Symmetry: C4
Subunit: 347 residues, 4 copies
C-alpha cells in the first residue's frame, strides 16, 4: 500500500518550464570552452551528437559532425556489411570519430564484430526501454568481449535504470523516454519522464560513478541544449535540428514553394518496413550543417557567458534554474510583434 | 461550518496531467497478459468495453467486440423487445459475451426480465448521477430478484459513492462524471471530477471490497487507457474511439473527401428525442471513419502491451499495484506529443 | 515593518474554469429542487438571476420580462432622472413586478434616488468601479439615513475588507466583481482585480457573518459557472452577455454577414461614456438569442441538474455543503467536448 | 548544495498576477504620478523610451521629455551623431535627455562627447549587467564624472543589482529576456520572469535607496502598474512606443493598416548597421505620442485609485498582488464577445 499511495507524488519538468538564472561572470562567450570528454578514448570539441536515425545520420552527416568537432551515429537500418562500410568511410576521411547504433537482437554481436573491425569509436545499444533485462544482459555480454570499447546504452529516464546500465558495463548512458519531436511513445503507451527532470535524475546517479550522460531528444532551440547541459548532461543528441541539413540522408523536396527533407521516427511505420511509437513528416531545408552548428554553439557560448561558465563542468555544477508558468513561456518568446523576417536561430 | 473552509482544498488530475514512469522489466510486450476478471462469471481477454450509446454499440458491434476478447453494451434507446432480440443475437453467434444497459425507470425490471431470459451476461444500470438514491434503491431491487446476475452500476466519481453502490449489490462500479468526448455535463451543470483522479479515488475504495472499477470516458489515445488501468481500473469504456469503426451503428458520410460517422451524447437533443424537462448534457457530432473494429483494437492493445512492458508488468494486477506516475505541466504535454515537425502521414494510432 | 513588502505575492486566486463541483449523495431529482432565493424580506426571487444594469442589457422591456420569469432587472443609469423614474413606474405598473435601478456616486445621486423611490423602486444599485472607495461608503451612509427601509445594493468589491465596509455603511446586499466581465478591460488597463470565484468566496465568507447576501457579477459564460458561483457563496448571480442578445434587451437586431447580432458594450467603453478617465471596457456584438424565456430555461435547467448532482434541496444547502475540486488546463479541456466534430448546436453550448 | 538547489526558485510575470483592490479615499484625477530617480533627474511621468534604433532618436526624446518622461538616444550611430542628437534635444527648451553607451574600449570617448553635449544621464547598456566588464566600466565613469547619472543594466538578480550599486551606478535597469522582440531566453536559455526580476532587484536596491527601472515585457498599461507595484520607480517601453509618430522610421501600408518597423538591437538588422538575440518585425502605427502617453498615464491613475495610492511610493510599499492561472488571465481579458472596434487602450 506504499506503492498505492505514492502513485502521484513525483513531479517533472521539461525545457519550456524553466529558465537559467543569470550569474556573476568574468568570462566572455568568445572565451568559453565547449569541449567535452565522454571517455579517455572519446573526446569532443563541441557537445553535439547527431541521432542514429535513417533520416538523420549516415556517412556524410557523420563526417560533417566530426569536422565541426561533434559526433555522428550511423543508424542500424541497413545490413551489417553496409553499416561497417559507412563506419569505415568516416574513418577513411582523416581518422574522424564515428559511432554506430546496434539493437538488442540475436545478430547484435555479429554486427558489433564488423563494426569493431571497422574501427568504430563507440556503439550505441539502442532500445526503447533501456531498463529492460535484455538490454542489461547484452551490455554485459558486449562488455566482456570488448573491455576497451566505448559502450553507450539507452534509453532510460530514471536513476534506478542508470545505475543498472552502468553496472552492466555502460560507460555512457543515454537519457530520454518520449521527448522526441517525432515520438509518440508517451501518447500510445502513456510512458515517459519530462526530459529535463529525466536528465537531472539520471545525471544525479551518473555523477556518483563518474559516468557522463547524453541528453537525447526534445531540443527545439539552442537554449534547450544549454538547459540540458546545465541539468547534468555532458553532451546532447539532436534529431530534428539536424534533419533539414544538406548532409542528412534523403532528398530535398518542394512543398508549397519551400524546400523540405523527410524526417521520421525510427518507430514510425515507414522506418519499420510491434505497434508504432513514431511519426513521419518533414522539416525545412537548412543548407550545410556548418551554419546550424554555428548557431547552436553560438547560443551555447552566450548561455555559458550569462552563467559565468568558463567550461561545461562549471555549468553542470553551478548553473541554477528558475521555474515559470505558461505566461512566463509566452514572455520568453517574442510577443505582440509581427515578425517580418526569419532569424538564423528562430523559426 | 467546517465544510465552508474545505471548499477548495481538493485537487484533481487527468490523463494529460501525468505520465507513467518506466521501471525494471524482465517482460516483453509480446509476453504480457491483458486478461481481466470482472466477476465469477465475467472474464474479458482484453480490457475493452464499448459504450452503451445509440451511436456506438448494437448487435453488430457487440459481436465484433466479443470476438476480440472484449465486451459490448447494447444501448437502451430501443424497445424492450428489440434489445432482448439483439442480446439473443450476440449469444447465438457462438457463445459470445454481451452486456446491456438499463435506465433507472419504473419499467426497469420489465426490461431486465426480458434481458435475463435472453441470457444477458451483464446489466449496466446507467444514470447521470450514480450517487442518486433512486439508483441505489434500484440496485437493491435488482440484486434481490437476481442474486446471480452481474450488475454494473454508475456513474460515480467519489469513494463514498462507490461504497454505496457496492453495498447495494453492484459487483462492478463504473467511474466517470463529465470526461466524455461528447459530454457537456461539467460545462452546463458545473459538476465533475477529473477522470484519472476519479478512477484513482473510486479504485481505492473498491479495492477494499474486492470490486472492479470501469474507467468510462475521456480516453482519446491508447496511452490514456494504460494510464487508467494503472490508476486502478480493471477495464475501460470507450465511446469516441469506437464510434468510427465499421461495426458501429449508422452509415458513413463524407467530409473533406474523407469518411465520417455520427457520434453523439446520450444526453444530446437528438438522443433524448429518440429515447423518449431536462436540459441537454451532451452534443451531437461525428468522428473519422476507421474501418473494421479489429484494426482499432489491435492498436489499442498494442499500446497497452508496450506500456505494460515499460512498467515491467506481466499482468494487469501488477500494473494496478505498482505503476508509478509523474506529474507534468502544459509544456510537458506539448513535449509528449509530436512537435515542431509537420506530419505527412496519419499513423494507425495517432490522429 | 517589512510585512507589506513580503506579502506582495502570497495570495492565490481561482476562477470558474479552475474548478469543478464534486458530485455527492443526492436524495433529490433536478425537477424537485427549489431555486427560490431571499435577498431581503421585501425582495424575494423565484430564480437566482439578475440582469445587469447596462444600457445594452436592461430597460423596461427587459426588467418586466426578468420579473415575470421570477428574476430581477436593474434599469441602467444612462438616462435622465425623469426617464429612469418613468422606466421604473412602467415596470411597477405592469402587474406589480420587482424592479431595481442603478445609481452612480455623483453629486446628483440623492436627487435621482428620490425619484426612483417616488416611482416605488424596490432596490437601488449603488454602482461604482471601486466599491472600497470612501465616496461610495459615504453615499451608502447618506441613503441609509434618509431611507432606512430601502433596499441598497452596493458594489463592486472583491475583498472581505471591502465587503465588511459596505455592510457597516448600511448596504443589505453586496455585489461582487472587479474585472471578470466579458466586456471588461479593467484588469488589462489598470492591472487590478481578483479572480471571480475566489472573489465571491472571500466576500461571502465575510458577508455570511452578517447575514448579508452576495451577488456574483460578471465572468459567467456558461450555466455551470452560475452553479459554481452560487456554490461558492453567492445568493444570486448577475449576467450581462448571456442576456445581451435576447429579444427584450435594448437595441435593435443588426445583421452582420447574414447572421443577426445585437450590440453589447461595456459601461466604461468609449461609446457608453459619451451617453478625463480612460476606457475600462470594449464595444462588441453578441448573437441574437430570441426570447428571454428560452435563455432562462437553459440556465435554470443547468442549475437544477447541478443542484441534483450535489444533493442540494435548496440554494442554502448548496452554499453550505457543496465542495469543489481544483484542476489544470488539461482538466478544463477534458471538461469541454473534445476530439469530436460538432455538427449541430446545443441550446446551452455555444 | 549547489546541485540540489537547481530547481527550487519560482518566477512570476505580469500575466500571472493581478493587483488586489484596497481601501481608497483618492480619485485617479488626484494622484501624484511624479518620480525622483536622483537629485538631478526627476520625471513627472514614470515613462522612459527605450534606447533602440527604431524607438528613440531626437524627435522621440523631445516629445517624451515635454510629456514629463525621458528618451534614451540609441548607440547605433557615430559618437559625433549621438552628441548632436543630445544637443538637439537640449536646445529644444533644456529638456532632459539620456544616451546609450555600450561596454567597449572607446566607451569613455563616447561618454566624453555625450557629457560635453550636456547629457543628463548615460545608460551603460549591455546584455549581461552582472559581467565584470560592465562593473569595471561603471567604476571608470563614476571615478571621472562623480555627478553624472549612470544607469547600468541589464540585470535580473539581487546579487547583480548589489554589484552595480556598489560599482557606482545610481540607477539600475532590470530585465533579462522579457522584451517583445527578444529571443535571449530562447537562444541562450537564460532569464528570469520579469515581475519577479523587478521585485528581487527592488528588494536589494531598496536597501541602498537606489531606484530600479523595469525594462521590457510591458504590452498593456496594466502591466506597467504591476511593474511599479512590484518595486520599480519607472518603466522602459519599446513596442508601445515604436508605432508612435515621433519614433524613427516611416509608415508602411499593409492591407489598409499602417505599420512601423520594430526590431531588437540584437537582431541581425541592427547588428549589421555573435548570434542574434532578437528579431525584426513591425508594430501598428499609433499616431502622435501624446495619445499613447495619455492612455498609459490614465491607466496608471486608474490602478493607483484602485490601490489607494496617492503617490507612486505608496504603491511600491503597499500594493498587494494575487496569483492566478491561465484561466484567470483568460477571464481578465475580454472574452466570449466579438469586439467591433479598437479601444484606445486595448489592441
Ligand atoms: O551581446 C550579446 C548579444 N547582443 C546584443 C543584445 C542586446 C540587447 C539584449 C541582449 N543582447 N546586442 C548586440 C550587438 C552586437 C553583437 C551582439 C549583441 N549577448 C551576450 C551574451 C552573453 C554575455 C556574457 C558576458 C558578457 C556579455 C554577454 C553578451
Ligand atoms: O520497441 C518498441 C518500439 N520500436 C522502436 C522504438 C525505438 C526507440 C523509441 C521508441 N520506439 N523501434 C522499433 C523497430 C521495430 C519494431 C518496434 C520498434 N517499443 C517497446 C516498448 C516496450 C518495451 C519493453 C521491454 C523491451 C522492449 C520494449 C520496446
Ligand atoms: O470609473 C472608472 C471607469 N468607468 C466606468 C466603469 C464601469 C464599470 C466598471 C469599470 N469601470 N464607467 C465610466 C463612465 C464614465 C467615466 C469612467 C467610467 N474607473 C475608476 C478607477 C479607479 C477609481 C478609484 C476611486 C474612485 C473611482 C475610480 C474609478
Ligand atoms: O439525466 C440527466 C441527463 N440525461 C442524460 C445523460 C446521459 C449520460 C450522462 C449525462 N446525462 N440522458 C438523458 C435522457 C433523457 C433525459 C435526460 C437525460 N441529468 C441528471 C442530472 C442530475 C441528476 C441528479 C440526480 C438524479 C438524476 C440526475 C440526472
Ligand atoms: O520513432 C521513434 N519513437 C520514439 N522515439 C524516437 C523515435 N525515433 C527516434 N526517437 C528518439 O528521439 C530522438 C530525436 O529527438 P529530436 O531531437 O526531437 O528529433 C532520437 O535520438 C531518439 O532518441
Ligand atoms: O450525453 C452525454 N452526457 C454526458 N456523458 C455522456 C453522454 N453520453 C455518453 N456519455 C458518457 O461518456 C462516455 C463516452 O466517453 P468517450 O470515450 O470520451 O466518448 C460514455 O460511455 C458515457 O459514460
Ligand atoms: O465597461 C465596463 N468595464 C468593466 N466592467 C464592466 C463594464 N461594464 C459592465 N461591467 C461589469 O461586467 C458585468 C457584465 O458581466 P458579463 O456577464 O461577463 O457580461 C456587469 O454587470 C458589470 O458588473
Ligand atoms: O535585440 C534585443 N535582444 C534582447 N533584448 C532586447 C533587444 N533589443 C531591445 N531589448 C530590450 O527589450 C526592451 C524593449 O521591451 P518591450 O517593451 O517589450 O519591447 C528594450 O528596452 C531592451 O531592454
Amino acid at each position: 500500500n506504499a506503492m498505492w499511495e505514492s502513485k502521484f507524488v513525483k513531479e517533472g519538468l521539461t525545457f519550456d518550464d524553466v529558465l537559467l538564472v543569470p550569474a556573476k561572470s568574468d568570462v566572455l562567450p568568445r572565451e568559453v570552452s565547449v569541449k567535452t570528454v565522454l571517455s579517455e578514448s572519446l573526446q569532443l570539441n563541441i557537445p553535439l551528437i547527431s541521432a542514429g536515425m535513417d533520416t538523420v545520420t549516415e556517412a556524410d552527416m557523420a563526417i560533417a559532425m566530426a569536422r565541426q568537432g561533434g559526433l555522428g551515429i550511423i543508424h542500424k537500418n541497413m545490413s551489417i556489411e553496409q553499416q561497417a562500410e559507412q563506419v569505415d568511410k568516416v574513418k577513411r576521411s582523416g581518422g574522424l570519430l564515428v559511432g554506430a547504433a546496434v539493437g538488442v537482437t540475436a545478430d547484435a554481436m555479429t554486427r558489433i564484430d564488423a563494426l569493431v573491425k571497422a574501427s568504430v569509436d563507440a556503439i550505441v545499444l539502442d532500445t526503447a526501454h533501456g531498463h529492460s533485462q535484455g538490454v542489461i544482459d547484452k551490455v554485459k555480454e558486449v562488455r566482456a568481449k570488448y573491455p576497451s570499447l566505448n559502450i553507450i546504452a539507452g534509453n532510460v529516464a530514471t536513476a534506478e535504470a542508470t545505475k543498472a546500465l552502468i553496472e552492466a558495463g555502460a560507460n555512457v548512458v543515454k537519457v530520454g523516454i518520449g521527448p522526441g519531436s517525432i515520438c509518440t511513445t508517451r501518447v500510445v503507451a502513456g510512458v515517459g519522464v519530462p526530459q529535463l527532470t529525466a536528465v537531472y535524475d539520471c545525471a544525479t546517479e551518473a555523477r556518483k560513478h563518474g559516468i557522463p550522460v547524453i541528453a537525447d531528444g526534445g531540443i527545439k532551440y539552442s537554449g534547450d541544449m544549454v538547459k540540458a547541459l546545465a541539468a547534468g548532461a555532458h553532451v546532447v543528441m539532436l534529431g530534428s535540428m539536424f534533419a533539414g541539413v544538406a548532409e542528412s540522408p534523403g532528398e530535398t523536396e518542394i512543398y508549397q514553394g519551400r524546400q523540405f527533407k523527410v524526417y521520421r521516427g525510427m518507430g514510425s511505420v515507414g522506418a519499420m518496413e510491434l505497434v508504432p511509437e513514431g511519426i513521419e513528416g518533414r522539416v525545412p531545408y537548412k543548407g550545410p550543417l556548418a551554419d546550424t552548428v554555428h548557431q547552436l554553439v553560438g547560443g551555447l557560448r552566450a548561455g555559458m557567458g550569462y552563467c559565468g561558465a568558463q567550461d561545461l563542468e562549471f555549468l553542470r555544477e553551478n548553473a541554477q534554474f528558475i521555474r515559470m508558468s505558461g505566461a512566463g513561456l509566452l514572455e520568453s518568446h517574442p510577443h505582440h510583434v509581427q515578425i517580418t523576417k526569419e532569424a538564423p536561430n528562430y523559426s
